[PDB]
Symmetry: C3
Subunit: 490 residues, 3 copies
């Protein structure tokens, strides 16, 4: 009559890494790193994004003629742009504080276009100017949301305009200044030389003067256009004055909603799906705390690490080999209803079992460990992407250094944490088996023989009931004391 | 005659958290998170703060007539300001590089004022100008630290002024330029159009031109004032030249004492009390390494984390349930002078005791662990909080992201460290008790009998000397070898 | 006969610190912090650096007459500059976007100088002007890379220049503007007043106007020169137009190598050695993951920490003490070929041995632990120094905060990891010894007597063959069952 204590084995292949051993085969393991995506650009929280196509933000806001499908645009979750868009400023020039404008646009999610200065109010100036830089069907055209003011007859009277913000929210306004190529152009389009453009609000004051010089030809023109923007607050007034070289606004963009968004630089197209975290390669649907798909993500996404394998050991070491011996010689492939268990070989029968209390305690501990590792990582909505000009390289280097510093910190911490936790779990399982063996030995005392292969041989004739008794935890030592003593001495 | 080994239990109700278990009762515990504050704005290192009240830094530095209390400010420890101060620039305008000026004023103390260009030296100009915005008792007035130069008679001669810095330290100088509303104002105040303001030092060269345009009315005026500042070095000269629109300074600001300070935005008042670390809600007086009062602190303060509980286990589990028995089935309540100890029962009266060597070793170990966790944190003076304009949103986002990332790193590290150390301590105590049990068993050998509940019953008569020897560690096996063997056989 | 189980001891005095104890002497230990440098500056990847002597970057790029040793400069690995160079702008002035230029030079390893606007092309102007500030041998001179244009006779025609970039790479061009001290100087140098300087490329468009004012005397002059730079792209034209006050370029700097470099502030010369990582005090040659030599490093360097001692415990505890006893009364000094082993004493002699399996397993575990700690740190090329101007103090403070935060995080993590790992390995060794003792006891069963000091006394006659059978894990218990039985009961 023998009783043996052991653990459980299977046909698993997955391997984990500990701080002392590498490539250790375990029974059950949990992957806490996500490596897959759907490869498609989908909606964020059920709202389709804004697809600029071949247009740029400046071209969309200014009203580039090759972007007329973007005039009235619905609700958006984020903006999709190309790395090198083709349809931007049709007329060669520049845009002041472009990056700040893009950063502001990353938190809007809806604009409403309001006609603040109609084109018919300029009754003392010509408002039908155009250029071949952005022409439609051959005939010259211009930006749709802007007005080019030239001379009427041989006179250019002082141009004045005003607007009071009675719309309901903040309103973005854009204006421009034209830099000619020679004095002949200046006198042909604005009569007099030595002009200025003055813009004034409650908290703004700007005066600009055109620059006339020969420049290299871009899109066939030696002239330029410089654009500036401002934010007008509620119940505030904006004033425009000009003697020449003014590209007036006709529309203003009031902010309808506000929230969290970003700019994704992709060359793909929207397709029908819905997710919660978006990457340029695809979308992520997971509950794990780590991923290694792409550094630039928008939404509520797991932490990004430079790792290829992060596996937490959830089960026992898989020694496949085992008269049936116990935990000294290896694991057991017979018993399948528990982690730690018994095997009895009495006359009534020979069979496996599984201790319930120890297995439940170990299961609770391991599950609590996994939940502590996973559910302690704070996740927040973020748009990890910023844009800097060619004269702000130091700030870009600063941002990059911060990002890589955090990446290395998190990578090192995650790898080391996984290694030590795996070691501790593997030690914990052996400790539990040894504790069960010691408990049985202490409770059951001298009436037996310790075969030393990991299990016990009784001296009396223990029937089934005594086997359940020793498994139960309540074993009557005095009952068999006399009978066991007789055979033990002989 | 029997001897039992066990541990200590009391009526404590403290609770800690481990990596495998939650809500575990312990005998003693230490809180390493501070969650309390005085509730008062104190004096840092004895020096009282600078209380601006309803004033701004610009108002204090320029001499707003309402803020006539702060004309003789003494030494300060930190600056207290309001989120939206009321008395700032009475005459509408702007202040260039305002945030850099505030950042400089952070690491300055005491501060002295020296008259450099007395108002009585401008003998060829008028100096009694004023406005109704900065009015005292109804009559018009102006800033106290600045002079408004206006034409005298019907002429405005070229205005020149030089100052050599022989004070003894670096100096702060502020000047301004006036932007009128119409040309009639310009001719009434300065008699000529097309003026300039030129400022020159050894490392500075600035030329500014007035802007005349119609603007929205702020405080009843359409005109504006633009203010600029510079830092004059020792033995360096500053030159002012102007044809019009010059607001000259009369007082320069010498830096008197340097150090470390900051700006705190609070709607509070100073009260008689002292501290060493300050928070906008109150003062912190603690030595613990972590706190969760407020993220914006001035001084040398513990690390800020987003947690509500950080408790370290410095004791044993509280399993208070014991024919005395030992450590197998629970702790004792009679032991009041040790952690691990003995209970002895013989013919000369039973009683408790306490093993001193093991208890002392464990106490020293736990003390070293707590001191290692606490004393390896670096605490340096810092003042969390900076200011950014409305055109620097990207820099503000960068600062916010950096602070949030560090906060997340520290929170995660602290929680995981506490959990792992709690698990290790709770295993350490069990290992110590089992070590004591094994040592006693090895000493006593076959002369005794084990009972399985944690203690031994002898096979001879073991009086107080015998049992003290067992506790002492010097137990004589040969002395009772014959006596104990005789009883064991039968 | 007698067998004993023990561990190794030696004469080492290396001490390590754990989380529970301090100053624990160990047999072997490994230092993972580097503290040694050669105290010399030398080549990075074989290329000698660019030693600027007493010159500065601006003085080198503009051609200071006292910097004529750098007119033709070969390839470099990094740049060495003094903190306060004596030789800079000989003519007093400024240099716009200097820090951006230095950052650009922090990623270029070779320049090629190309003559783009020959000095003899200006046939309508005088090009021989020079000043006493940049004097050579007592005669007035000027920069060697720039041309000072001045009126010929009594006429200053419009000056026009152009250059088309057909060189083959990106190019750097620097121009200047002159600010005189009085109208007399302007009239004597350029005849006319009301002057502009215009520079134009396909992206850049700049117009500047001279300022005439009385300024403090620097280097004996009250005039200034302001320099600006631009990056011309391939197949792009740059145009210069001027009516006066133009300091034209004569040379352009084409990028020829491109790579990763940096600027180091030092005060020494260049020696003959080679290194992969460089610090201002010396070079580092190590494979360890941490160092405390200097924070400002250039190259591929280990992490910087503020610790003074980081030692990992590789060997076991040194407890020098003692037939002879076992592992409870100290470690054996006579064992030299292993970590854990046996001592045997029988009628054919006495001696020591070593258990190869346990020692090999422990050695592999410790090696893997050290390798895991060491080879999981990412070492990329980096340059830490960054330069900021006097108006960018907030940016500098943000940079300093990031560096301090990362330093603190890494120091805390390294120290805590070392302490915890030392405690775990010190427990690991004791666990291994106890496991060997338990294995021998289980194999030997009741045939022996456990003396209690780690030694077993046999109840029979055991020759050398039986002793070796015990050590190799193959003991035939039944064969000695009968013989050892008689001696036990007698
Ligand atoms: C020298 C001086 O301070 N002169 C005026 C001053 C200026 O005219 C300028 O407006 C600076 O603020 O302005 C003050 O007076 C004004 C009114 O009294 C007048 O009715 O309307 C003016 C505007 O058209 C102007 O507001 C003022 O600021 O109240 C004071 C002083 O007379
Ligand atoms: C074409 C030229 O370099 N001419 C002067 C030059 C200019 O007058 C200007 O000052 C640029 O530095 O300046 C030099 O000469 C000067 C003295 O010789 C003279 O006594 O005082 C001048 C100032 O009032 C001026 O300093 C010079 O820099 O020394 C050289 C050259 O003659
Ligand atoms: C009012 C106006 O737009 N005038 C003419 C402009 C200007 O003269 C400048 O060239 C500015 O581009 O130029 C065009 O010839 C051209 O761009 O082809 C179009 C048009 O005839
Ligand atoms: C572990 O196994 C992988 C294959 O899955 C192999 O590439 C790697 O070299 C192994 N490492 C060790 C240390 O055996
Ligand atoms: C703008 O309109 C608001 C009401 O919508 C009014 O109170 C305000 O006075 C107006 N602005 C001006 C300059 O009149
Ligand atoms: C096992 O213990 C339970 C107590 O929960 C008892 O009800 C049951 O009868 C016991 N079984 C045996 C075989 O002793
Ligand atoms: C300013 O005063 C110092 C004396 O402390 C003198 O050396 C210096 O020349 C003076 N400045 C000027 C411009 O003369
Ligand atoms: C801080 O608390 C201690 C009590 O531990 C007290 O002695 C000390 O006076 C307190 N200091 C302040 C500034 O409140
Ligand atoms: C107990 O140990 C102490 C050692 O400090 C010794 O002085 C004393 O005599 C010992 N007593 C007995 C009864 O062994
Ligand atoms: C450990 O040794 C160092 C000398 O190396 C000594 O300064 C320190 O005080 C010692 N610490 C303890 C706890 O003995
Ligand atoms: C650096 O150390 C290595 C040892 O691995 C040695 O071979 C090499 O010569 C050393 N180089 C220098 C420049 O000291
Ligand atoms: C162990 O060594 C002994 C030598 O005494 C040898 O007889 C035996 O076969 C060895 N066993 C194994 C498994 O290597």
């Amino acid at each position: 009559d023998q009783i043996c204590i052991g653990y459980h084995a299977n046909n698993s292949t997955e391997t984990v890494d500990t701080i002392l051993e590498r490539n250790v085969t375990v029974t059950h393991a949990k992957d806490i790193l996500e490596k897959t995506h759907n490869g498609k650009l989908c909606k964020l929280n059920g709202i389709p994004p804004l697809e600029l196509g071949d247009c740029s933000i400046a071209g969309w806001l200014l009203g580039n003629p090759e972007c007329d499908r973007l005039l009235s645009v619905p609700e958006w979750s984020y903006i999709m742009e190309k790395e090198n868009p083709r349809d931007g400023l049709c007329y060669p020039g520049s845009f002041n504080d472009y990056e700040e404008l893009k950063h502001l646009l990353s938190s809007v999610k809806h604009f409403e276009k309001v006609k603040i200065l109609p084109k018919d109010r300029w009754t003392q100036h010509t408002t039908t100017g155009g250029s071949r830089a952005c022409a439609v069907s051959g005939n010259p055209s211009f930006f749709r949301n802007m007005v080019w003011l030239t001379k009427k007859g041989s006179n250019y009277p002082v141009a004045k305009g005003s607007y009071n913000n009675t719309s309901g929210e903040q309103m973005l306004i854009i204006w421009g200044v034209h830099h000619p190529n020679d004095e002949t152009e200046q006198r042909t389009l604005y009569q007099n030389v030595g002009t200025y453009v003055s813009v004034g609000t409650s908290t703004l004051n700007k005066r600009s003067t055109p620059d006339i010089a020969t420049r290299p030809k871009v899109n066939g023109l030696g002239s330029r256009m410089e654009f500036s923007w401002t934010l007008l607050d509620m119940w505030d007034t904006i004033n425009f004055e000009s003697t020449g070289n003014l590209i007036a606004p006709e529309y203003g963009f009031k902010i309808s909603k506000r929230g969290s968004s970003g700019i994704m630089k992709t060359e793909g197209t929207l397709e029908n799906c819905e997710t919660k975290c978006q990457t340029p390669l695809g979308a992520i649907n997971t509950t794990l705390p780590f991923h290694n798909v792409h550094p630039l993500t928008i939404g509520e996404c797991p932490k990004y690490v430079k790792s290829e394998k992060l596996v937490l050991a959830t089960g026992l070491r898989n020694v496949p080999q085992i008269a049936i011996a116990g935990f000294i010689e290896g694991g057991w492939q017979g018993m399948v209803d528990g982690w730690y268990g018994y095997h009895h070989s009495n006359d009534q029968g020979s069979g496996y079992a599984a201790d319930k209390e120890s297995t439940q305690k170990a299961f609770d501990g391991i599950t609590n460990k996994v939940n502590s590792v996973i559910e302690k990582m704070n996740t927040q909505f973020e748009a990890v992407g910023k844009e800097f000009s060619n004269l702000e390289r130091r700030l870009e280097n600063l941002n990059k250094k911060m990002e890589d510093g955090f990446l290395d910190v998190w990578t090192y911490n995650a790898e080391l944490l996984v290694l030590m936790e795996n070691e501790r779990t593997l030690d914990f399982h052996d400790s539990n088996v040894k504790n069960l063996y010691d408990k049985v030995r202490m409770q059951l005392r001298d009436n037996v023989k310790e075969l030393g292969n990991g299990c016990f041989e009784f001296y009396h004739k223990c029937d089934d009931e005594c086997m359940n008794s020793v498994k139960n935890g309540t074993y009557d030592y005095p009952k068999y004391e006399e009978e066991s003593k007789l055979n033990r001495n002989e």
